[PDB]
Amino acid sequence: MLCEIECRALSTAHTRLIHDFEPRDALTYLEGKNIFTEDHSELISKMSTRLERIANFLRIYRRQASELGPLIDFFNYNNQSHLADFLEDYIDFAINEPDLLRPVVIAPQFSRQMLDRKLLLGNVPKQMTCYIREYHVDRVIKKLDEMCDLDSFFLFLHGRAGSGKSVIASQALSKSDQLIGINYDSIVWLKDSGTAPKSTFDLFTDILLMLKSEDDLLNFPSVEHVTSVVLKRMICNALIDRPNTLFVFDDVVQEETIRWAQELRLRCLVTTRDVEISNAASQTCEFIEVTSLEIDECYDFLEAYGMPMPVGEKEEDVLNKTIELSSGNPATLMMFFKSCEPKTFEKMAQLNNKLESRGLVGVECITPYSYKSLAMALQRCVEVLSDEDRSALAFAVVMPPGVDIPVKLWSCVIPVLDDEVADRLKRLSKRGALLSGKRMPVLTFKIDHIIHMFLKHVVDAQTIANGISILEQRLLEIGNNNETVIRPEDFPKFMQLHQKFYDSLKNFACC
């Protein structure tokens, strides 16, 4: 057999091998130098048209000869030297040079290939354009390049809900031209969102079909009934035709997904909310955490779709009210914009009011998000939660949001050495980024604002006033024992510092 260069030569020189040649002229010479056979030569010598003798000479030749010699050493003698010069020149431009073309560009407009054709067919969503989070999309592309060598790997683009992970994955695979084509041959992007136990199998069923040729989508069987081991074998089967293939798993909830992905030795990007599913994978697990939109990126984001930037001080303050409320969060920021109608700072502060006295239901709008309001999203993040963690979270309402506070200061409201509280609050930030860990000055957590007004109009109206009382109680019992600064231990006895917000919460439960 030949190889890629020499077959590239026999393929490249065809416009030429048609204008002047005849295989019969060569048959004896190949029957001779021992590289053909008299049936082979029979097959090529009695052929009506010359294109016949040529196509058979080029198919038949590649099996018998160890190389492409006795055909350069022939176009010479046959007065067809204009062929053998092109071919010896090419063999020199490959035997004599350790450099050619690499995987790059020489037939341009990958703009309809990689952008249009391959992205679209892999169901990759239409990347966002009017604003791009530089850092994150960048690190995604980077960390994908570093791994294009690797056989199977997980990249976990994990964050809060509506925190913007999927959009960033949309952008990292739609910007560059490397990820699809240079680093990976094909793309498959599938949304999970599976909750039932039947969901994790159905998923890889639609992978198996994302793979299948345009031919035989017709032949699709009642495939619904066949063991998991067989679907798995069928995939890692149909996966031969797929050299360096990238898999995006948008919105994974069940760790069974990750386990199948790791039994099937797949290469995976994963957008998710719960970070701990990676414990399912025993491997180079690499992470990129989607943080809350910083105050300045929020500005960038506002400007980007045409929203007017402040002037009076209590207007920059109005917008810091918004940035404070939606504790840096893409999705609720977007719903917010879509619903700011006249564009005025005035109607914007109007919404700033609507949010404290009607919760997230006050700004729910039609948005590129599948969810009417972020509360619909967090819903799920809260159902999956361990019953006990569901409890701890359910109680963290009666805290101060956007305040760094001690573990013991939390031990007062949270159910059951009580480090165990901390253990729950850890599970709790890991699993939907609902909390916020901060190791020193003192092991302290923090509850954001969005993650609060979810709970406000959502936890049992009684349990609010009860958490307030259970606090004023254990606080008082601590009373009987006797800014960039953490709250000192001489002063836990008076949560009255946060009386203002504590006073608001109270009116909500007691009425």
Binding site: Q379, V382, E383, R390, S391, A394, V458, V459, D460, T463
Partner: peptide
């Protein structure tokens, strides 16, 4: 708790 989660 949690009015239909």
């Amino acid at each position: 708790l949690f009015n239909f989660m």
